[PDB]
Amino acid sequence: GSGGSLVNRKQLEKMANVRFRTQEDEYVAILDALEEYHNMSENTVVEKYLKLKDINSLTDICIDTYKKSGRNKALKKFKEYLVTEVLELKNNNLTPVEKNLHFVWIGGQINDTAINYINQWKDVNSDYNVNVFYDSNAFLINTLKKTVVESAINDTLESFRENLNDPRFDYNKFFRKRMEIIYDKQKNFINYYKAQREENPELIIDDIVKTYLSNEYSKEIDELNTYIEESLNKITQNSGNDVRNFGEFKNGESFNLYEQELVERWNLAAASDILRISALKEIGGMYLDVDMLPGIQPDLFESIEKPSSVTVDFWEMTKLEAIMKYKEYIPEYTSEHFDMLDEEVQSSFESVLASKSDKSEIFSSLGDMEASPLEVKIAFNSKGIINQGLISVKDSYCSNLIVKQIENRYKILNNSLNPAISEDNDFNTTTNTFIDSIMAEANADNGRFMMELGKYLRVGFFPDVKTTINLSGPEAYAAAYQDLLMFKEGSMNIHLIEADLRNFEISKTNISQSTEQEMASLWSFDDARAKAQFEEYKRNYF
Amino acid sequence: GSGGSLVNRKQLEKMANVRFRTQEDEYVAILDALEEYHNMSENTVVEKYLKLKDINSLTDICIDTYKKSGRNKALKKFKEYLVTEVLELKNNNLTPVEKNLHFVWIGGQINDTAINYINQWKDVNSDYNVNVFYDSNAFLINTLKKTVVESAINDTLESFRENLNDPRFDYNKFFRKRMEIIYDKQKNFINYYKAQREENPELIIDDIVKTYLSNEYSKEIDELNTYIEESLNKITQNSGNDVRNFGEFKNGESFNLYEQELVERWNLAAASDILRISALKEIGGMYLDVDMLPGIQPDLFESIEKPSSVTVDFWEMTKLEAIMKYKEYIPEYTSEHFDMLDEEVQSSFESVLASKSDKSEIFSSLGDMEASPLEVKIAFNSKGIINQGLISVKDSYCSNLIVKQIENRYKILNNSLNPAISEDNDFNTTTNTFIDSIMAEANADNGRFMMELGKYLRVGFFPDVKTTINLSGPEAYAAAYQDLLMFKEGSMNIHLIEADLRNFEISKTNISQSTEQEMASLWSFDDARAKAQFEEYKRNYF
Amino acid sequence: GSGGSLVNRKQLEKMANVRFRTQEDEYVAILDALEEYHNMSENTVVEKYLKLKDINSLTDICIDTYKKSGRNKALKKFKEYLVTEVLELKNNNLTPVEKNLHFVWIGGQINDTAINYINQWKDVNSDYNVNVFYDSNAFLINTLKKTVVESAINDTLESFRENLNDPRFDYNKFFRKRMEIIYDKQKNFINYYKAQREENPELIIDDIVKTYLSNEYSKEIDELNTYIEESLNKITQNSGNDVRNFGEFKNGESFNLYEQELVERWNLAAASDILRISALKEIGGMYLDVDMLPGIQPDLFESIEKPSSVTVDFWEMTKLEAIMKYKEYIPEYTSEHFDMLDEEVQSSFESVLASKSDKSEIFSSLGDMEASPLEVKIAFNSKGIINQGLISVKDSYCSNLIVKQIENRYKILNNSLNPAISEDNDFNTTTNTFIDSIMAEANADNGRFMMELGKYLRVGFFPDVKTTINLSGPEAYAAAYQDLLMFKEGSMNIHLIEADLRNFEISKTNISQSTEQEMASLWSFDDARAKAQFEEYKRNYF
Ligand SMILES: O=c1ccn([C@@H]2O[C@H](COP(=O)(O)OP(=O)(O)O)[C@@H](O)[C@H]2O)c(=O)[nH]1
Ligand SMILES: O=c1ccn([C@@H]2O[C@H](COP(=O)(O)OP(=O)(O)O)[C@@H](O)[C@H]2O)c(=O)[nH]1
C-alpha cells in the first residue's frame, strides 16, 4: 500500500489554509475524500483511480463555487498532483498480461505475405496463443468493393472521352464524378441488403453479396463459392478465430458499428480498428497489424555503426532486409535498400548475420509482460501514435474508455448522418446536408474533430481523408488518455502533447515497425499521387 | 411471467410500419430492445423498469433523429404504453413491507402530547417495531432558536418605540428588521460553531450550544444539563432510536444537509423531512408525522349519517373528538367541535361509541402491508400530497429517487448560496446576492422551483415561505414520481396532474389525518396572521 | 564544299527506279532540285537548309500525289537522309558566337544574391560583354502584384472565419475565391491603365502604378520614388542594359506580348522568357537565368570519388557548396548538404579545394564559342530541356523559329482570350468562356497544347499550371526544333524524343546548374505544398 506523491489531508490543509478564514461545506469535501483515499491500501488500483476521479471533480467544484477564494491557486496545483498520482498508480502497480497475440483480417481471403509475417511471431513466441481473427459471413466484402469501384472508374472515364483534353476535367473532377456513381452503387446494394435481411433474417452477408454480383455485375456464383472455400481453409489452417464465435462482441453495442463499416461502407480498415480494441477489452493481450514484424535483438547488430548520409529509419529498414536476404525466411522480401549500400558493409552484415544458427538469436521474444489495468500501451511511428501495436490487460480501464470513445464518435456521426442518408438524394446533396447538420451541432470543443467527420462519405474514394483516424483510429486512443488524465469521459478535442502520450508507449524494442508492407501501407493518398493515378486510368482505356 | 399491456416487437412493427420504407439502425434499436424486455420473466421488477427506461430513451431518439418520419405519431403513442406498463408493473408485482413504524422528533425535548399520539399506534400495532428517532447531539437546537428569535424581537420592538404610531413601521418592516438581527445572531453562532469544531473535533453540537448560551445570552449550563438528561430519559423510555447509531445515514451524502438545516438554520421541520425518507430507503416501513393518529374502522360509525350544513372534514375531525371524550385515551383532547353539535346526535355517538369494549374495536390496525419496490406511497391532504404518511419497501426505486431529488435541490441551493454567505455582509445584501445568482442559473424548467428557493434565508422568520416544501418536502416527492413516469432523473418542474399522483396514494383508511395537533400545525403563516402577532408583540413590551 | 551523306540525283534515281515505269512531272521535281542542292558549295548553310526544306516538301507531294507508287517506301527513306543532312549541316559548318552574356531582371529591384551570381560569371569571363537587362518603365510591377495578392489573401481569409472548421472550405476553395478577387483587382488596374495611357500617351508604366497604389492601396508615392531611384542606381552600376534602348525589340511584334505578361498579368517569368530569345536573335550570345553559376573545372575534383548512398545531383550540389564555405565568394551560401557529409571527406575537400590560389583554377571560362547559324543550344535539367541556358549565334534560323513559335502561340491565346475578357464578367464566367472557345478551335494536333493554354488566367495564383511553359517556355523551343527537323513551321504538338533534342544540348560542363537559388526556384507549386500554405495563411490572421 504505497502512499505515493499525493499529499495527505493535513498537507493539503497546509497548502491552502489562508489566514483568518473558516472551511466551507464544499472545501472539507475534498479533505474528507482525500483522507479516505489514503486508507485504501487493500483496494484495487482501478478503485483508487475512481476515488481520484471524484477528488479531482470535488476540487474543481470548490474552485468554481468561489472564484475569489485565494485557495484556488493552491488547489489548481493540487490538481497537478492527482495526475502524477494517476501516473504513479499506473507505473508502480502492474499486472501480468494475458499471452495472446491478436491479428485481424476480414473482408476477403487472407494474403500469404500477411501469413508469413504472422508466422514469424508465432515461431519465436511458442507460449503465446495466437488468434488471427476472420469473418465467415464476410469473405466477399472486398471483392464487392473491387467490382464496384472498378466498374465506377470505367463508367467515369467514358463520360469524359469527348472532353479528354479539356482542362476542366482534372483529377479532382474525376474522383468527384466517380464518387457520385460509387455512392449510388453502394447505396443500391444497401437497400437490397436491408430488404433481403428484413425478408429472411437467416441470410448471411456473403449470400446477399454473391447474389448481388450475379444479378448486376454478371458474376458466376460457383467461382465465388470456391473462393470462400479456399479462404476458409486457408484461415482455419492458420489459427483462425471467427468473430461470430466471439459473441461477446456481437452482443455489445460496438457491433452495429463493425457491420456499418464492413457491409455499408466496405471500410475494412475501420472495422479492424474497432475489433482490435474490443478484442483487447474482453480477451487481453497484444494486438498487431499484420504488416508488423517482431523486434530485432538489441545485441545482434550493436557492433556495426550507422552511415552519416542515410537516415535512421533507413537503417532500421535495412536491418530487416538483411535478415531476409541470407536467412531467407520470407519469399523475395525486397532487397532494395540493402543493394543501395557499400559492399564493404554489406559483407559486414553477411558475415556477422550468418554467424548465428537459428531464429531465436535474431528476433527477441515477448515472454512475460506486465502492464497496469489502467493503461493500454500504443505504438509510435514518426508522426504520433498509431494503433498497429496495442498491449493491454484484460478489461483495462483505458481499454474500456477507448471503446466508449469510439462508440460515442459513431453516435455523433450517425445522429447527423442517418437523417440525411434516409431521405435518399444525389451524393452531393446528401453530403451538403450531412455536413450542414454537423456544423450546427458543433461547439468549440468538437470543432477540430467535426471537420474531419464531415468527409466520412469520401473515405476510401478521395485524397486527404483522415475521418477514419478520428473515428476508430489514433485520435480516439488519444482522447481516452485525455479522459484518463483529465478525470473525465467523452473528451473529443485533444490537448495532450507528445510528451504526455509517451506515458503509454509500447517499448520500441518489442515491435519492428519498419517493415516492407508498412512502407506499402504508408503510401499515403496524397493529392499529387491521385493525379498520376488519373493519368494512369486515362492511359488504360486508350 | 405476465406480459402486460406493453406491445410485442411484431405488434409495434405493425403500429408503425409505413409502406415502402426500410428500418433504420436507430429504429431497430427499439425493436431489438423491446423483444428483450418480454423475455425477462425471471428478472426483478426493478430490472424490468430499467429496461423500459432504456426503451423509452431509445424511442425518443428515433423520433428526434428523424422528425419527418411518419412513424413518430405511432412512436409518440408507444411512449404512453410504457408509462402504463410501468404502472402495471407497480400494481401487479407487490412485495411485503417491513413492519416498522417510524417517528421523528429532534431539536428539543419530546412533548408528551406527541408521545400520547405515538402510543395509540404502538398499542393497536403490537407486531410493528416502532422507532421514534431522536438526536443526542442536538437537544438544544430548539432552545437556541427560542433564545435568539425572542431576543431579536425584544431588540426590534425597542428600535421602534419612538416611531410606534408612524405607519411606515408596519408588520412588514418589523419582520424585515427582526430577520436582519436574527441572521446576524444566527451567523455569529455558526462562525463560533465552525471554529470550535475546527479546534476540537471531539465536541458535539450541544456542548457548543450550551457554551454559546452561557457566554452571550446569560444561561446557567447546569439547568440545560438537567434538560438534556430529562429529555434523554424521556425518549429512551419511549422506543428512542438515535440517529448517531444510524451511521448508514451519516456516511451518506444527505447527512451534510441534515446538519445544515439542524445546526446552521435551526429548521427542525426540514431536517425531519430529510431523515424520514432516508430512513425508509435503508430500513423500510411507514413513516408518520407525530401529529398523526391511526385509522378509524370503516364499520364503527357506518350507521350514523352526516349533517348537511357542516363540511366533511369537520365530520372526520369530530369522529376523533368523540373517541377522546368518552373512552378518554388522551388528556383533554379538545372537545370543541363535538360541543358544536346537536345533543340528539351527541347521544347517538355516546351510545354507539360506548357500545365497544377495548381499543381494537375502535382503530383499524395495519398488519400485513404490500407495496411495489418501485413505489413510495404518500398521503393526500385537501391541498395536494403531503409527506406526513409515507409507506415504502426497503430500498425502493422511488425511495432512492426522492433522496437523489433532495440531494440535487440542496446542491443547486448551496452552489448559489454558499458563495454569497461566505463573503459576509448584511442580511439584505446577502439575500440580494443569493437571489441574483439564482436567477442567472435559472432556465425555463427550474424557474417555478427557483422562485421559492430564493426565500431560503427567510424560512421560519417570515410569512408565505414555501421554500422548505420545494427542498425536502412534497415537491421533491412529486418530482421523483415524474422522474419515474418520464423515465428520467432530476426533473425539477412538475407537470403531473393530481390524478397521476393518486397512483401513489396511501389508502385513506390507514391514516386518520384530521387530528387536533394537525389543525394546530396547519395554522399556516398567512400575511394577516403575522400582523396580529406584531400587534401582540407590540402589546407585550407596553 | 562538303557533299555530306545526302545522296546525289543518280543515287536517288537508283534508290527508287522501279522497272518499266517512266518519271512523272512531279517525281523529276525532286531530282532537278536535289541536283541543284549539291551545286551550292559557295552558298550559305542557311540557304542550303531552305533548299532541303523545299526538297523535303517536294518529296512528300510526290508520295501524296501517287499513293500507289512503289517508289514511296524509298522516298519515305529519302526523307530520313534529309534530316540527317540537316544535322550534318548543323554540326559541320560552325560560326563564332558573339561574346555576350545576357541576364534579365524586370518588375522590381534587382536582388543582391542575383548580382553575386552574375559577378561570378563577370569575373572569370573578362572578354565577354555582359548585359543585365532591366526596364526603367517597370520597377513597380512586382510591388503592384505583392500589394494585390496579399490584399486578396486578407479579404479571402475573413470571408471564411465563420466557416473555418467547415471541411468544404479547403485549400482548393480558398485559392478559387482568392483568384476571383485577384482577377477583379488585376482587371480594375488594367481598365485604369488602358484609360490613363489612352488619355496621356506620354505616361510610363510606373507613373500609372504608383498613382494606382496611392489612391486605392494607400501608399505614399515618395517611398516608391526612393525605391525606383535605389533600383536604377543598383542596376546602372551593375552593367544595366535598358529594354527601352533596345528599340529593335519594341518595334518587333513580340513586344505587345512582353508588355501583356508584364503589365496585364504581372508574370515577370513570362516576360523574361520572351525577352531572352528575342535578345539572342538580334544580339547573339549566351542567355542565362540569374540563378545559374559558371562551370566547375573537369580536373578540379577528379581525384575524389562519389558516395554510394547519396545521389549524383546531391554530389554536384555540394561541389558548389564546398567552394562557398572556404573560398567564401558569396555571403552565407547555405552549407546545408556539405554538413550532411562524412568529416573525413569534408577534410578531403577542405584540403584539395584550398590547394588552389585564385578563381581561375576553380571555374572554367567560356572563351571562344562555336555554334551553327541553324541552331540554338539549350540546357537540360533532369526533367527535360530548360531555357535557363541558351547559346545562340546572331540571327540564327532556330532563334527566329523560336520567336515565331512564341508569337503564334500568343496569337492563338489572344484570339480566343481577348473576345472573352472584353465583355467583362466574373472571373469564373470569363474562364468558362475562354476555355469553351479554345476547345472549339482545337484540333488533334494542338490538343495537348490547348489543354494547358486554358489555365492561362490561373498562372501564378494556382497549383499545377504549366501554361507559361507552353507559351514562352521550353515547349516552344521544342516546337522550333520540330519545325527545323520536320522542315515545317508552326508545329504545336511535339513528337520529338529526348534523344532527338540532345542534338541541341549546351555541353554540361559550361553551366553549373545545381545552384542554391535553382533549388529555391525548383520548389514546384505542388497541390500539397499549396495546402500547407493555406494552413499557414490561416494561422496568420488568427
Ligand atoms: O482487406 C483487408 C486489409 C486490411 N485489413 C486490416 O487493416 C489494417 C491496416 O493495415 P495497413 O498496414 O494496410 O494500414 P496502416 O495502418 O499500416 O496504414 C490491417 O492490420 C488489417 O487488420 C483488413 O481487415 N482487411
Ligand atoms: O421541534 C420539532 C417539531 C417538529 N419536528 C418534526 O416536524 C414534523 C412536522 O410536524 P408538524 O405537524 O408540526 O408540521 P406540518 O408538516 O404538519 O406543518 C414532525 O412530525 C416532526 O418529525 C421536529 O423534528 N422537531
Ligand SMILES: O=c1ccn([C@@H]2O[C@H](COP(=O)(O)OP(=O)(O)O)[C@@H](O)[C@H]2O)c(=O)[nH]1
Ligand atoms: O522578379 C523577377 C524574378 C524572376 N525574373 C526572371 O525569371 C527568371 C526565372 O528564374 P527562376 O530560377 O526564378 O525560375 P525557374 O528556375 O523556376 O525557371 C529569372 O532568370 C529572371 O530572368 C524576373 O524577371 N523578375
Ligand SMILES: [Mn+2]
Ligand atoms: Mn501498414
Ligand SMILES: [Mn+2]
Ligand atoms: Mn402537522
Ligand SMILES: [Mn+2]
Ligand atoms: Mn531557377
